[model samples]
Target: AMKKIEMIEISQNRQNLTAFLHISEIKAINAKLADGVDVDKKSFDEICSIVLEQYQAKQISNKQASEIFETLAKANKSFKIEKFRCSHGYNEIYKYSPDHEAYLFYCKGGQGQLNKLIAENGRFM
Candidate 1:
């Protein structure tokens, strides 16, 4: 039996990556998002296939694919979609390393990338 897939166009860069993702595939895609991922799973492969094959993306590495997949999974949960221009970047804030524990912050955007950091002191809860 042939499976029917619903389609949507992902306007990413010059290449209009048409997402021929189905309703059934939705659950699979979401699982990788809200929960821990096991790369051995079929869903993991599907994400890579759809992103690379359908989208005609660059030579994306496993790490890169993971990032892209994770973002889509999250956006699916939040009822929002990240734009094609959504590029991931991160910063690990450290204060003399051993002196104070630091954390890494991540973000994806195109223009007006904020580059802002706002912190409050002694606020618990």
Candidate 2:
């Protein structure tokens, strides 16, 4: 029936419409922001949304839009955030800040935006 086919199509779309979000990935989006039943939920959602938008769009992405993910900690005290670092090369793209502390990632211009985004949003300097 027409209705049956439509339902099948809809189901396929629902599954196909997928996005990837990573805690360490900096960006804007929809993947990580899952629908949940609390204050912490908003922060988590926003982080996922922003990250996926950037992921989906790819490079030359908006810094602020993607950068907002760092604010999760500020937005929700209950949220645990990771601080990342990379050495001179592709040694690593960190998910959590090491006890020693360190950094990588490329952005337009330089690190100013990086400093600005975190400074404005979360508890970073």
Q: Assess every candidate by TM-score.
A: 0.21, 0.22
Which lDDT tens digits does candidate 1 get at residues 1-125? 11112112211212222243454455554443323432233443355456455333443344444545545443333222222122334323211222333322334433344232212211111
Q: How does model 1 fare in lDDT? A: 0.35
Against the reference, the lDDT scores of all candidates come to 0.35, 0.35
Residue 103 of model 2 has an lDDT of 41
**What is the C-alpha lDDT profile of model 2 across 38-102, one tens digit per residue?**
12323344434444444456532434333333333233334223343334343333324345454
Error in Å for residue 14 of model 2? 26
Tally clashing residue pairs in candidate 1: 0
